[PDB]
Write a protein that binds this DNA or RNA. Structure first.
Ligand SMILES: [Zn+2]
Length: 267
DNA sequence: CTCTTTTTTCTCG
DNA sequence: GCGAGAAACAAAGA
């Protein structure tokens, strides 16, 4: 669940639940509500959903007039809109019941989280998380990006995954971005020349923007994406690179599975 | 049976 | 502060 997948979920939710009054909230796994489930149930029951926003890989439900429910899907979180009589599935943990349907949150690994905070605490919340800029030409400044890369000895893939240089990249799109920009994942950032940094900056924006347009990569809301048919290296071990023909290899970098073309991504 | 594979954040040294 | 390794947790494959 990287930025593209989260944005796809945000869009579907925006089109379907905005304006809906929450009738009741139930939980079989209350511990995933970091701010306290009973407190959330008390505060949100009877309130109306005003909108759905996103920051990085974080979903933000705008409920009532001053409430903000921050939701992170982590690795396996999935939302689905179902009928009120829908049977329970093994990994369903929370449900927001409406008059003519319910929003169910499921997460096999139980990594996902819910946090209820106030409207004026959202900006501070993300500053504390140290989340970087959104991947858009408007917010992602190439100049600062370049300066941070020049001052570090960190490897490019692990650094990009930190969410500090830019928000939204996960294992899938970081591998796709580096292949597009012809940069090896273990390259120390202070070794990147200006032309490469420029290509990388543009590629981060292009790949993520393309993934959003195609509804993310599907493998519930959002399982309609088509980006998985556009992947050039992630999970393509042993296949031929679409540019040079060499076999895509898979190695481990900072503990993460890493796919790359040994020819196009030198070093 | 064991070992490995698949976002965020903390413990070590 | 950093890098290495791993925990949180569940399922499936070698
Ligand atoms: Zn290649």
């Amino acid at each position: 669940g990287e930025l593209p997948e989260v944005e796809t979920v945000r869009r579907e939710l925006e089109k379907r639940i905005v304006g809906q009054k929450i009738i009741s909230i139930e939980a079989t796994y209350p511990r995933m509500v970091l701010t306290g489930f009973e407190q959330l149930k008390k505060e949100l029951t009877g309130k109306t959903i005003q909108g759905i926003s996103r920051r990085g890989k974080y979903l933000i439900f705008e409920i009532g007039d001053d409430f903000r429910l921050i939701s992170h899907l982590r690795m396996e979180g999935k939302y689905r809109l179902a009928t009120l009589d829908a049977p329970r599935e093994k990994h369903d943990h929370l449900t927001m019941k409406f008059a003519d349907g319910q929003l169910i949150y499921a997460d096999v690994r139980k990594f996902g989280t819910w946090e209820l905070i106030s409207t004026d605490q959202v900006l501070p919340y993300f500053l504390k998380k140290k989340i970087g800029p959104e991947p858009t030409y408007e917010d992602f400044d190439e100049k600062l990006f370049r300066e941070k890369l020049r001052k570090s000895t960190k490897k490019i893939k692990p650094y990009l995954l930190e969410q500090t240089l830019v928000a939204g990249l996960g294992n899938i799109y970081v591998d796709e971005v580096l292949w597009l920009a012809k940069i090896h994942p273990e390259k120390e950032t202070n070794q990147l020349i200006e032309s490469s940094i420029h290509l990388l900056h543009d590629s981060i924006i292009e790949i993520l923007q393309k993934a959003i347009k195609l509804g993310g990569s599907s493998i519930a809301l959002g399982s309609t994406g088509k980006m998985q048919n556009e992947l050039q290296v992630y999970g393509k071990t042993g296949e031929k690179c679409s540019r040079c023909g060499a076999e895509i290899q898979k190695i481990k970098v900072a503990g993460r599975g890493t796919h790359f073309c040994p020819v196009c991504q030198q070093k």
